[PDB]
Every structure is written in C-alpha cells, then in structure tokens.
Amino acid sequence: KLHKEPATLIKAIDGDTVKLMYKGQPMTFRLLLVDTPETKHPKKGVEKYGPEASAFTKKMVENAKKIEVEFDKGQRTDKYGRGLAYIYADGKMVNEALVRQGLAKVAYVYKTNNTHEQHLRKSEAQAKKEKLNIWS
Numbered sequence: 001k002l003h004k005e006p007a008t009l010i011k012a013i014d015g016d017t018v019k020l021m022y023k024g025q026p027m028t029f030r031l032l033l034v035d036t037p038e039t040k041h042p043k044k045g046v047e048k049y050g051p052e053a054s055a056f057t058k059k060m061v062e063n064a065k066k067i068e069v070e071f072d073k074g075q076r077t078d079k080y081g082r083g084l085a086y087i088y089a090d091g092k093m094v095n096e097a098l099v100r101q102g103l104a105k106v107a108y109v110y111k112t113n114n115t116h117e118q119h120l121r122k123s124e125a126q127a128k129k130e131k132l133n134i135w136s
C-alpha cells in the first residue's frame with residue numbers, strides 16, 4: 001500500500017517537474033504517469049500549452065498549505081536522479097489535476113510504477129470528451 005509523506009516546496013520548474021525539500025534534502029521530482037508540453041529543451045522547442053501547464057502547476061503548489069509525496073511500488077528515481085512520485089497539494093493530486101484540464105497526457109507508463117494508471121486514464125478520457133486544451 002502507498003502512503004503520503006510531507007515535503008516542502010522549494011521551486012516549481014515546469015508543468016511536470018518541481019523541486020522540493022524531502023526528508024531534509026533538496027531534490028527534483030518528476031510527476032509519475034504524465035507528460036506536460038516541453039518548455040526547455042532545444043528539441044521541439046516551446047510546445048503549445050507548455051507555458052500554461054507550467055503556470056497551472058506553479059499556482060497549485062505555491063498556494064498549498066501542505067504538499068505531500070507518494071512514491072509508487074517500483075523505482076523511486078529516474079536515470080537523471082529525479083524522484084518519481086504522485087504529488088498532492090492540500091490533498092489534491094497534481095498529476096490528476098493536469099490530466100483533467102487537458103494540460104498533460106498519460107505517458108511513460110512503466111509496469112512497476114502504475115498504481116494510479118486507471119484513475120488518470122479516466123480523467124484523460126473526460127478531458128478528451130470535453131475537448132480541453134491539448135484536446136481542443
């Protein structure tokens with residue numbers, strides 16, 4: 001069973017990457033199961049909805065009273081040293097919030113870390129059906 005642990009915001013980087021203080025050390029976290037449009041890499045450049053996704057996440061984590069991280073059951077870091085988790089702002093999952101708004105797509109689904117896969121896929125279908133942002 002998964003469990004939530006407290007963390008403290010340091011800085012929001014983009015739609016799906018945030019820096020937090022976790023168990024007293026600064027770490028970069030990458031949200032599990034989603035992909036927000038790129039705003040940094042020279043390849044593909046600044047994708048559409050990139051800025052918007054960034055703005056969404058920033059606002060959500062910066063306005064929260066409490067931030068929590070919840071690791072899945074498999075690896076806890078990616079090849080770049082980033083923590084892989086579901087992040088909550090006042091008990092609301094940022095990962096899901098993004099999908100529900102059409103600011104991210106369900107992606108990077110690894111069999112070892114996919115506990116909330118179905119939950120996110122349901123939210124994505126709803127955003128598609130409402131033709132929001134990315135799906136417009």
Ligand SMILES: Cc1cn([C@H]2C[C@H](OP(=O)(O)O)[C@@H](COP(=O)(O)O)O2)c(=O)[nH]c1=O
Pocket residue numbers: 017030031032033034035036078079084107108110113
């Ligand atoms: C979400 C996630 C991404 N990644 C890796 C795959 C991609 O690698 P490559 O960069 O080598 O393509 C990259 C996607 O993250 P970004 O969307 O931040 O770029 O991070 C994982 O390894 N596991 C994960 O759970």
Ligand SMILES: [Ca+2]
Pocket residue numbers: 016035036037038
């Ligand atoms: Ca991304």
